[PDB]
Amino acid sequence: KTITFLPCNNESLAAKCLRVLHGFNYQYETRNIGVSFPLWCDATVGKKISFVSLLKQHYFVQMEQLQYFHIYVSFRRCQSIDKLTAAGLARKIRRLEKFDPSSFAQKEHTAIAHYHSLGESSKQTNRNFRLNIRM
Amino acid sequence: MKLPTNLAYERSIDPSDVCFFVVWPDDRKTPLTYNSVDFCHVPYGASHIECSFSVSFSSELRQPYKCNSSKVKQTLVQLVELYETKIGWTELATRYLMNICNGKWLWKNTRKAYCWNIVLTPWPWNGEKVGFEDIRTNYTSRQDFKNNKNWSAIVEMIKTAFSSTDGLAIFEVRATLHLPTNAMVRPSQVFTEKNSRVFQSTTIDGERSPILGAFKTGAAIATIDDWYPEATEPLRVGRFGVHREDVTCYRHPSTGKDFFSILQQAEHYIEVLSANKTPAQETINDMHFLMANLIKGGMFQHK
Amino acid sequence: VSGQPIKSATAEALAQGNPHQVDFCHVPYGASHIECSFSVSFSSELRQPY
Amino acid sequence: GERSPILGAFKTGAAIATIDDWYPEATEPLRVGRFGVHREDVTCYRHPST
RNA sequence: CUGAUAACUUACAGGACGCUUUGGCUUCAUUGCUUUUCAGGUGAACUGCCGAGUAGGUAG
Numbered sequence: 381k382t383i384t385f386l387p388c389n390n391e392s393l394a395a396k397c398l399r400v401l402h403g404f405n406y407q408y409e410t411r412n413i414g415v416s417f418p419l420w421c422d423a424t425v426g427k428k429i430s431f432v433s434l435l436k437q438h439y440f441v442q443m444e445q446l447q448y449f450h451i452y453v454s455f456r457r458c459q460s461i462d463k464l465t466a467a468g469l470a471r472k473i474r475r476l477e478k479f480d481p482s483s484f485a486q487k488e489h490t491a492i493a494h495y496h497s498l499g500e501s502s503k504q505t506n507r508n509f510r511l512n513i514r515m
Numbered sequence: 516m517k518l519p520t521n522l523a524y525e526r527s528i529d530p531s532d533v534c535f536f537v538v539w540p541d542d543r544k545t546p547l548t549y550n551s552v553d554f555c556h557v558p559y560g561a562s563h564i565e566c567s568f569s570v571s572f573s574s575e576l577r578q579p580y581k582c583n584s585s586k587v588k589q590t591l592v593q594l595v596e597l598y599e600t601k602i603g604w605t606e607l608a609t610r611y612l613m614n615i616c617n618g619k620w621l622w623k624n625t626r627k628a629y630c631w632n633i634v635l636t637p638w639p640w641n642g643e644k645v646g647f648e649d650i651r652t653n654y655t656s657r658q659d660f661k662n663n664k665n666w667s668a669i670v671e672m673i674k675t676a677f678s679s680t681d682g683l684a685i686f687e688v689r690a691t692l693h694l695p696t697n698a699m700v701r702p703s704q705v706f707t708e709k710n711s712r713v714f715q716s717t718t719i720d721g722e723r724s725p726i727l728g729a730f731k732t733g734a735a736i737a738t739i740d741d742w743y744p745e746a747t748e749p750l751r752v753g754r755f756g757v758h759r760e761d762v763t764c765y766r767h768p769s770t771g772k773d774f775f776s777i778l779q780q781a782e783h784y785i786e787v788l789s790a791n792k793t794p795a796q797e798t799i800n801d802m803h804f805l806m807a808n809l810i811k812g813g814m815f816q817h818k
Numbered sequence: 819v820s821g822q823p824i825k826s827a828t829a830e831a832l833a834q835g836n837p838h839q840v841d842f843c844h845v846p847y848g849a850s851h852i853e854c855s856f857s858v859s860f861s862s863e864l865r866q867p868y
Numbered sequence: 869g870e871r872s873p874i875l876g877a878f879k880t881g882a883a884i885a886t887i888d889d890w891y892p893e894a895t896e897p898l899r900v901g902r903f904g905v906h907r908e909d910v911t912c913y914r915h916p917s918t
Numbered sequence: 919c920u921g922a923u924a925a926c927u928u929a930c931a932g933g934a935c936g937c938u939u940u941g942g943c944u945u946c947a948u949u950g951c952u953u954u955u956c957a958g959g960u961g962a963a964c965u966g967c968c969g970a971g972u973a974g975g976u977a978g
Binding site for chain 1: 962963964965966967971972974975976977978
């Protein structure tokens with residue numbers, strides 16, 4: 381089904397829907413159901429979220445009671461974009477030591493094509509990351 | 516007193532661009548580079564960071580650079596020669612030099628630093644480069660700078676530079692910043708008539724390198740103004756002295772203590788200084804603000 | 819022109835920011851010094867009027 | 869192949885000809901010219917009334 | 919409710935032949951554009967695994 385948001389921020393709201401899809405897949409140990417957004421426009425991810433192959437989980441039911449809900453292409457994570465930040469460039473060098481560290485050099489000119497990260501976090505640790513998703 | 520149709524001075528303090536370097540272990544230096552928003556960070560195996568620039572103190576305050584009225588020209592030369600005799604240059608030269616000797620010209624890079632050191636190399640000088648080791652521990656207040664072995668000899672340079680028709684006083688400043696691993700560095704950035712931040716850069720060897728600008732550095736030496744009403748914190752010395760966190764003007768013309776209202780009272784200040792009764796603190800505060808804007812220079816015209 | 823404060827220049831609008839554009843020339847970092855060269859002639863044009 | 873700052877030819881000849889310190893109240897030498905002007909203080913020493 | 923009322927101007931056509939504008943010429947003396955100038959949004963999109971790897975993949 382397609383869940384259409386009608387109240388806002390589509391970035392930090394579609395990322396919450398995937399965390400419920402995340403925690404569902406470790407209770408039941410299933411990896412079949414996938415996610416895609418029909419309105420994947422350049423300005424924003426969109427207000428439409430669909431799953432193909434969840435609505436009985438506690439998140440989607442309580443959000444349904446309020447005024448806001450309704451309840452080919454490939455969307456894959458690109459973790460090379462997580463390596464392009466300068467905190468991630470230092471993570472890359474620490475592995476290669478574990479050797480001249482001054483022999484390395486920055487790119488000084490990089491171009492990035494439409495990475496669309498959705499911000500999420502971990503529950504095993506207290507640590508944050510992003511969902512850099514392209515077509 | 517009227518403002519003339521031509522009145523302009525030159526600046527008496529001339530800073531330069533600040534260049535950044537990366538010191539590797541076994542002590543070799545490499546100019547810092549950055550990526551492209553632009554982001555600049557310390558490389559991984561680096562030890563610390565050098566910063567270097569130069570400041571001159573070159574007495575342009577004594578006479579106007581351009582003045583089409585001989586009555587207003589003689590009004591300056593009485594003010595500078597009476598400020599020098601009655602008050603002296605010890606207060607302003609101390610307040611300028613403390614911004615060099617701590618890391619005031621290192622704007623947000625002092626932030627989250629382990630320790631930083633400043634080494635001066637004054638030019639009309641014999642030897643033994645003046646060192647300021649471990650600021651944020653050793654050099655906290657005004658009395659901490661005065662307890663240095665040679666602080667009087669460097670304050671008396673800037674006093675001699677202002678008190679002479681050819682005073683020169685060149686300083687070669689060099690800093691040593693010990694940052695955390697993969698730490699931020701915040702250089703200055705360009706002005707675009709428009710997140711989308713571009714750095715100001717030069718060329719050292721064959722590589723781009725961030726700078727901290729020459730006009731940005733002079734705005735950090737001249738954060739002295741605290742003589743305005745309330746005076747919670749120092750303000751960059753300027754006419755109708757503004758703050759830039761909040762877009763406000765303290766010393767507005769409605770206050771009556773901007774630089775253009777103190778110019779009309781500059782004839783009044785000569786008989787106050789030529790008497791024998793010591794002047795009140797409020798009047799001298801307006802004399803410190805009068806002198807610090809002539810060190811800053813600028814067009815002072817009208818019509 | 820006369821000398822009174824203009825009332826459109828409030829304390830917000832007078833702290834706004836004035837951008838200028840200048841040429842900037844300085845000495846490079848690793849440089850030693852600077853050469854400057856030209857030439858002069860002294861060639862007797864005052865003997866008779868042109 | 870680069871642009872480079874000059875210090876011009878007419879500017880340089882003005883510096884060689886700062887000789888005039890015979891105007892009636894002379895302290896500082898002036899650039900030699902008819903009714904020898906001083907552009908520090910925007911006036912003419914050696915005015916035709918002198 | 920008009921100097922009112924009404925109104926077919928038509929047919930046909932060869933402008934052509936000829937043509938030297940040219941000679942001569944000194945624009946030239948003098949020249950200071952200058953003074954003063956903060957672009958800021960950097961709390962953060964982290965920490966591991968695989969690989970001989972500044973290649974490239976994936977975990978939370």
